[PDB]
Amino acid sequence: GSEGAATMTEDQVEILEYNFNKVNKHPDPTTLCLIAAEAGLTEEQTQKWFKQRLAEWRRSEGLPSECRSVTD
């Protein structure tokens, strides 16, 4: 019946990427709002992109781990 699934395009990926490396990774709702209206998305959707994309960036740049172990 109702899935509610939408696919993105190259235009959105070209803009969403520009506001990730040439701006920041954790932009406030103020800057996020500008990106949404730009590409044509919403603050809720734009947030998911940065959230998911961040999972890969952390692996590229390199960061520690949040896990308390008795040995490690």
Curated annotation (Swiss-Prot):
Q: Which PROSITE patterns match?
A: HOMEOBOX_2 (PS50071)
GO BP terms:
chaperone-mediated protein complex assembly; heart development; lung alveolus development; negative regulation of cell differentiation; negative regulation of transcription by RNA polymerase II; positive regulation of gap junction assembly; positive regulation of skeletal muscle tissue regeneration; positive regulation of striated muscle cell differentiation
Main function: Atypical homeodomain protein which does not bind DNA and is required to modulate cardiac growth and development. Acts via its interaction with SRF, thereby modulating the expression of SRF-dependent cardiac-specific genes and cardiac development. Prevents SRF-dependent transcription either by inhibiting SRF binding to DNA or by recruiting histone deacetylase (HDAC) proteins that prevent transcription by SRF. Overexpression causes cardiac hypertrophy. Acts as a co-chaperone for HSPA1A and HSPA1B chaperone proteins and assists in chaperone-mediated protein refolding.
Report the GO terms under cellular component. Answer: cytoplasm; nucleus
- State the Gene Ontology terms under molecular function: DNA binding; histone deacetylase regulator activity
Q: Which InterPro entries match?
A: HD (IPR001356), Homeodomain-like_sf (IPR009057), HOPX (IPR039162)
Report the DNA-binding ranges: 9-61
Task: Name where it's found.
Answer: Nucleus; Cytoplasm
Loss of this gene results in the following: Mice display partial embryonic lethality and heart failure.
Which tissues and organs express this gene's product? Expressed in the embryonic and adult heart and in the adult brain, liver, lung, skeletal muscle, intestine and spleen. Throughout embryonic and postnatal development, it is expressed in the myocardium.
Summarize the subunit comment.
Interacts with serum response factor (SRF). Component of a large complex containing histone deacetylases such as HDAC2. Interacts with the acetylated forms of HSPA1A and HSPA1B. Interacts with HSPA8.
Q: What protein am I looking at?
A: Homeodomain-only protein
Keyword terms of this UniProt record? Cytoplasm, Developmental protein, Homeobox, Nucleus, Repressor, Transcription, Transcription regulation
- Lineage top rank: taxon: Eukaryota
Kindly report the protein's main subcellular placement as a broad class: nucleus
Which factors induce or repress this protein, as stated in its UniProt record? Answer: By the transcription factor NKX2-5 that acts as a direct regulator.
Disulphide bond pairs: none
